[PDB]
Paper text:
Malate dehydrogenase (MDH, EC 1.1.1.37) catalyzes a dehydrogenation reaction from malic acid to generate oxaloacetic acid, which is accompanied by reduced NAD generating NADH. MDH from T. thermophilus (TtMDH) is more similar in amino acid sequence to NADP-dependent chloroplastic MDH than NAD-dependent bacterial and mitochondrial MDHs. The molecular mass of TtMDH in solution determined by analytical gel filtration chromatography was about 61 kDa, so TtMDH is a homodimeric enzyme like most MDHs. Similar to other MDHs, a protomer of TtMDH has the N-terminal NAD binding domain and C-terminal catalytic domain and consists of 12 helices and 11 β-strands.
To gain further insight into the co-substrate recognition and activity relationship for TtMDH, we attempted to soak the apo-form crystal with NAD. In addition, we found a mass of electron density in co-substrate binding site of TtMDH that could be modeled as NAD. Unlike the apo form of TtMDH, crystal structure of NAD-bound TtMDH belongs to the P212121 space group with four molecules in an asymmetric unit; however, a homodimer should be formed with identical subunits in the crystal lattice. Nevertheless, electron densities for residues 91–100 were relatively weak and poorly defined. They correspond to the mobile loop covering the catalytic site, which is disordered as in the 3D structures of most other MDHs. NAD binds to TtMDH in the same extended conformation seen for other members of this enzyme family. The adenine ring binds in a hydrophobic crevice defined by Leu41, Ile43, Ile108, Thr10, Gly11, Gly88, and the backbone of Gly88 and Ala89. Residue 42 of TtMDH is a glutamate, which hydrogen-bonds to the adenine ribose instead of the otherwise conserved aspartate in other MDHs. The NAD pyrophosphate is hydrogen-bonded to the backbone of residue 15 and 16, but nicotinamide ribose is hydrogen-bonded to the side-chain of residue Asn131 through 2′-hydroxyl. However, the increasing B-factor value, slight movement of the binding loop and few structural elements around the NAD binding site indicate that conformational change is significant for TtMDH activity.
Author numbering:
A (entry chain D): 1 to 92, 101 to 326
B (entry chain A): 1 to 91, 101 to 326
Amino acid sequence: MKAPVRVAVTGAAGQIGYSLLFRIAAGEMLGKDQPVILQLLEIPQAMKALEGVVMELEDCAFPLLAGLEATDDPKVAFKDADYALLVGAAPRLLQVNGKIFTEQGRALAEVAKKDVKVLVVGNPANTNALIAYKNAPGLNPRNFTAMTRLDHNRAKAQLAKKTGTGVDRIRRMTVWGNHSSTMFPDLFHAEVDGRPALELVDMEWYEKVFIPTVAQRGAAIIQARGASSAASAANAAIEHIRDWALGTPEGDWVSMAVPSQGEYGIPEGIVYSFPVTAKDGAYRVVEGLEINEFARKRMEITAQELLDEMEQVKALGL
Amino acid sequence: MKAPVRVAVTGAAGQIGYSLLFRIAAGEMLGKDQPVILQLLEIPQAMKALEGVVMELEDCAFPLLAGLEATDDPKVAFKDADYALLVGAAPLLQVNGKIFTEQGRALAEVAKKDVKVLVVGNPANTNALIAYKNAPGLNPRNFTAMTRLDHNRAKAQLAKKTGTGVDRIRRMTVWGNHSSTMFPDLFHAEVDGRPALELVDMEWYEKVFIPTVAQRGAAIIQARGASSAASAANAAIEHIRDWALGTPEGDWVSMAVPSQGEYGIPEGIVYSFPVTAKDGAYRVVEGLEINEFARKRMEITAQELLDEMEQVKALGL
């Protein structure tokens, strides 16, 4: 019934975009009652391939796809966007990523809706989201986020498997920090069918199996498939946006990397994964948690990495 | 939260699978209240890649994915299957003969008696034929092939031309099979409750629409450097979904199903008809007036499928 919303998506002809766009047009991201207009962006070199993706989207005959355009100019892609998924990044320099997210930052602040919701997916996501909101004058910095939902989902999957519990009964999972080898999956607050996770697993498995498995999971899939985890990444992005926009379940929370306002003693400014609830299009960092020494030490090590990256970005005036 | 159903999918680590499995596991195919168990089949050389796909599905934390296994053994993949999506085919007629003879047999041996079978791998109509012929004990009526992609392509082209939403287009039909000689039918199709030819003309229908639909797959390969995996997967999902959950009232879809001899289509071949579906059963729309322009074009694929059916018999498949 609702009026259409505009969804901008970059890197739209790449593997993540190919897994992402069809499910967005199907209504899996914002609901069955919410028509979407897709505004897709690519580099000029990939525009030919992007037109092929457009033909396929058309070929699904999606009833919620209320509009569809493809461009290589950010000021057209971001034009009156309500949502902006920044999937495309440097092909793998902090130089290149810097120029992308500065350009895309100012473009968003130029032509997007004032309360546009921004999700950075391309790595390094946390620092790219930093560069982006930093160069987005007039836009609330808190509308800029980066994705740790995949680590979140990966962590949850390993816990369900270990405890013989369905994933739908795993709640209050948390991944702190950035999307990197220093990320911290937190089982001290996680619940398995209403029991504390560490009632059902002990510390040695946590430290020696669970944390390394989640942290190394991307490399394993690359090993098996000969390609990165596009589909589970895209599903993660979809859920990141969906929970942000439609709300988190009562009693639960998710991981979102957001500009730190100092909570849990995390340095201000940097984009950092927190436990969050979301309601009516707005997230709130979950307060009132107790942080022990093991958690604290690992949360600080991610923070330091992010602080290192921030001071390096500032070293280039970005 | 109904009891889970088992869904078998072959060629699971291929491009179409990679687009398929995640939407299925999410509940897009059978509904949000229907848990599924995915039983994934690949060839031995692809099992390593398939394990990667398994990891990825797990990493989505899908609440409706009640189970998940990977195997290179059809008798394992198809065990107690309620649905079977036969996506993997030859990467010729000999090779497909072996594949779909074996998979028809596996299905007979171990799948549910009322297992709904969808053949996606090309040439789908004949592969479905070989599979139902080698499936003693299963109903031939449950063996189907996909023409939903062409159907959907055709809708997309009619919508673009008339400037209306795709949701105002109903009763599209693509007769025959997934091939260049397929027949998209505008004589029965409707735009906003009006006959399509009151909104577009015969010349455009003839010289633009029909070849545009037939050449579409090639146009996508030319653009992406790869085939239509995602829209193919989407067509497969809707094929099953409409079959399972029913078609909208006043509407119908295309499905290639065993012909019983109607509409001048030789009996026994699998052939795309306009069909409705209600309660997991499909029914060919009957009593449509067919004109000679259409009949002639339908018979091209009807006769080329009949030839394939005879050619398959001569090879004892």
